[PDB]
Every structure is written in structure tokens, then in C-alpha cells.
């Protein structure tokens, strides 16, 4: 088959700051009839992949100008001027000269932009919710820049870490940022057996984490 | 109009086939050949099949022994249905254009011998508000569902900015999703802020408008 690699597995850059990335194919990408079939594609996170370049070099309706394709044969590079916050996503090479119609493996475009501290927020289980045989609390810690966070929960001081479901946003095509909620999940009477309930959030901004938290007995 | 909208279902039992409409607008598929191309999470894109204006086809060999790509020139659609699917062959499956690259929307295929659980929708709203006339952020909960696909909005659409669904987590063999939505202090009491809901495979719409409340 036509072995496509992209060798940029994961690629963090500043908006503005310019960026390639290359892909390689284990047979020439030249046809017969002349041309050199090679696509570079964008799948953004959700949406579906959108093609910004064909032939090589030509550009798609729509697609910026600051993108510029290159290359021949099994080397063909794609290059983006200078790197907007709508760039983020991944990024494939396909090649269609030879029947398997083969893709690139990814390259992960993140975009570096400064840090940022989480703005969390803490929300109790919904009576709609304790109705039934449990009673979730989840809390939101949002817009924070590196990824990389941990919240630890916290029943009256005892520090909870069963019951608790973590889930990252990935990067935001607009502020940039990363997001992420924890749903810690009690027994409806194992719940309000208790008072306080805390959600804490150690990133990078500071040395002593974020804590979020409320109090059964006030509002 | 150049668009290629999609459909089949979003469960399957093992072995049982699958079974995709792609019904493409605004070209000629006698004029264009439609690939099929599908995403293994965490995998990729990779190439299942095509079939040409001239109706001829091309599979991937690794799939050629249960893939059957047929279309219909005038209805303006193409049939994907593959056959002995197992649950490693759970992926969104694609339809996209040969030429001028249109994709379709993606239909997700699950393939376990599992319950269609109609998820539970409940609000999150915050014990206390904030007095500085900054923000306030209410959220949103989708517990108990099986086939993930689900779709989730604010206010349908109008409230589109602050808006952050994360992706559902799946614990003892149910998926959880979660949105949240920080509009400014004033807000809030003023505009009425609701979370539409919608687990397609359970014919399930609901609609929860984040309301007050204090303990």
C-alpha cells in the first residue's frame, strides 16, 4: 500500500508564529496522466474534516491564503504563515494515485497562547436529581491554558476519590483554553449525611490550589 | 446548496449489518463519486471503499469481504451496509465527496448487545449568586443513556457563545454529559435560559430551563 507519514505527531504554536507540517509517502505521488494527487484536509474538534488543499498547491473556495502546499513526488510539506486561533484541530495528508486512497496518520495543531487559571464553580445535586437513588455534584473548572489540572474532592474534609467522573473540553477555537468538569456522585442519604463539599484545583497560576465549595445548612 | 446528509443507526448488535444512507445534494452523481470513509476514536480516517459515477467500485482490501457500496443516480444516493460487524468496528462513519471535498455530518456507530437508555436531563443552577455584576454560570446534566450520540444547546442555538459541552464519560456502561453556560449577572434573572436536550435512539427531547434556588 501507499504508507503516508506526517511527521509532526503533536505541534504547539504562538498565533502568528508560522507552521509546517510534512507528509511522506512510500511511493510517488506522480500519475500517468501527469498530475500528483495529494490533499491536506482539517478536522477541527466536533465538526467534520474540511479539504484546504488539493493538488499539492491549489487552495480550496474559502480556504485563507495562509496556507501554502508543497512538494512532489513522496515530499510534500503544508505551511501556515502565520497561525490564527481557528486553526486548532488535526491536520491529514491523503493521496489519491493509488487505489488504497491512504490518509496521514494526524498531526495535532495546538495553539500556545499564555496561561490561564481555571474559574470554577461548584453546583449542588438538583432535588429533580435526589429524587431518585443518588445525587451528583459536579463542578465546572473552566478557561484555564495548560490542560493539565487535577481537582480533588473533599466530603467534610475527608477528600473524596471514588465516585468522581473527570472530563476535558479540548482546545477552544476561540480564548484558546482548556476546560474541564468533575462529577462526584453520591447515594441520595449518603449525601445529605454530610455538610460541606469541596472541589479544589491545583494548576500552574498559583502554589496553593483553587477551592470551591458549599454548605448544606446555608445558601 | 452542496451538502452529503447522512443516516443509519447508532447501535448495533454484533454480527448484525449496518446499513447508511448518504443522500448528497447540490451535484451529480453521475458526475461524482462518493467515498466512504469512517474514524476508529482515537485511530483515525481510514478508507473503506468508493463507487464511481460509472457505478463501478474500489474497497479497501481489509474490507472488501463485507462491504456493499450501491447508490441510486437519480434519488441522488449511495448505500453503504457492511455485514458480521463486532464492536471494534464501532467508529463514525463518513461519506464524502470525491471531487470538490464535501463531507457528510458522520453517523456513530456503537456496536454492543446493550440497552438504547433514555438519558435523565437535570439543571444546575447556583446556590448563590454572584453580587458583583460580573458572571453567573448555570450547567447542564445528561445522566443515564446508552448510544452516545446526543445533542445538547442552550436557549436551541440563541445562546451559543460561553457555552461548553464536555464530552460524555462512560462509568458502569452509561454515559454521563455535562454543558455549562456563563452569561453576566444581569442575565440570568432577566433572560431565560434553558437546556435543550436529545438522545437520537430514543426519540427523546427535553428542555430544562436553569431555574433559582437556595438551601
Known amino acids: 500500500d501507499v504508507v503516508m507519514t506526517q511527521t509532526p505527531l503533536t505541534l504547539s504554536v504562538t498565533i502568528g508564529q508560522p507552521a509546517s507540517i510534512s507528509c511522506k509517502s512510500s511511493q510517488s505521488l506522480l500519475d500517468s496522466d501527469g498530475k500528483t494527487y495529494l490533499n491536506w484536509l482539517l478536522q477541527r474538534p466536533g465538526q467534520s474534516p474540511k479539504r484546504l488543499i488539493y493538488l499539492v498547491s491549489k487552495l480550496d473556495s474559502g480556504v485563507p491564503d495562509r496556507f501554502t502546499g508543497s512538494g512532489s513526488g513522496t515530499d510534500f510539506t503544508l505551511k501556515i504563515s502565520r497561525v490564527e486561533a481557528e486553526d486548532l484541530g488535526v491536520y491529514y495528508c491523503w493521496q489519491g494515485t493509488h487505489f488504497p486512497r491512504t490518509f496521514g496518520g494526524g498531526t495535532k495543531l495546538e495553539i500556545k497562547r499564555a496561561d490561564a487559571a481555571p474559574t470554577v464553580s461548584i453546583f449542588p445535586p438538583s432535588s429533580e436529581q435526589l429524587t431518585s437513588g443518588g445525587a451528583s455534584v459536579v463542578c465546572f473548572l473552566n478557561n484555564f491554558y495548560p490542560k493539565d489540572i487535577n481537582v480533588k474532592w473533599k466530603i467534610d474534609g475527608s477528600e473524596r476519590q471514588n465516585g468522581v467522573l473527570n472530563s476535558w473540553t479540548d482546545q477552544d477555537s476561540k480564548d484558546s483554553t482548556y476546560s474541564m468538569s468533575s462529577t462526584l456522585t453520591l447515594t441520595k442519604d449518603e449525601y445529605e449525611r454530610h455538610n460541606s463539599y469541596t472541589c479544589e484545583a491545583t494548576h500552574k497560576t498559583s502554589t496553593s490550589p483553587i477551592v470551591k465549595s458549599f454548605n448544606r445548612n446555608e445558601c | 446548496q452542496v451538502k452529503l446528509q447522512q443516516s443509519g443507526p447508532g447501535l448495533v448488535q454484533p454480527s448484525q449489518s449496518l446499513s447508511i444512507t448518504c443522500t448528497v445534494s447540490?451535484?451529480?452523481?453521475?458526475?461524482?463519486?462518493v467515498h466512504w470513509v469512517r474514524q476508529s476514536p482515537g485511530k483515525g480516517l481510514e478508507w473503506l471503499g468508493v463507487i464511481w459515477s460509472g457505478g463501478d467500485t474500489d474497497y479497501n482490501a481489509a474490507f472488501i469481504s463485507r462491504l456493499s457500496i450501491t447508490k441510486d443516480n437519480s434519488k441522488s444516493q449511495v448505500f453503504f451496509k457492511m455485514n458480521s460487524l463486532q464492536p471494534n468496528d464501532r467508529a463514525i462513519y463518513y461519506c464524502?465527496?470525491?471531487?470538490?471535498?464535501?463531507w457528510g455530518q458522520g453517523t456513530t456507530v456503537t456496536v454492543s448487545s446493550a440497552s438504547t437508555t433514555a438519558p435523565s436531563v437535570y439543571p444546575l443552577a447556583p446556590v448563590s449568586g454572584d453580587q458583583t455584576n460580573s458572571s453567573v454560570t448555570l450547567g447542564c446534566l445528561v445522566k443515564g443513556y446508552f448510544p452516545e450520540p446526543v445533542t445538547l444547546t442552550w436557549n436551541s442555538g440563541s445562546l451559543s457563545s460561553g457555552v461548553h459541552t464536555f464530552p460524555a464519560v462512560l462509568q458502569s456502561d452509561l454515559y454521563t454529559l455535562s454543558s455549562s453556560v456563563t452569561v453576566t449577572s444581569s442575565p440570568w434573572p432577566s433572560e431565560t435560559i434553558t437546556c435543550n436536550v436529545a438522545h437520537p435512539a430514543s426519540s427523546t427531547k427535553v428542555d430544562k430551563k436553569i431555574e433559582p434556588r437556595g438551601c
Open positions: 464524502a465527496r470525491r471531487g470538490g471535498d464535501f
Open positions: 447540490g451535484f451529480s452523481l453521475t458526475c461524482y463519486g
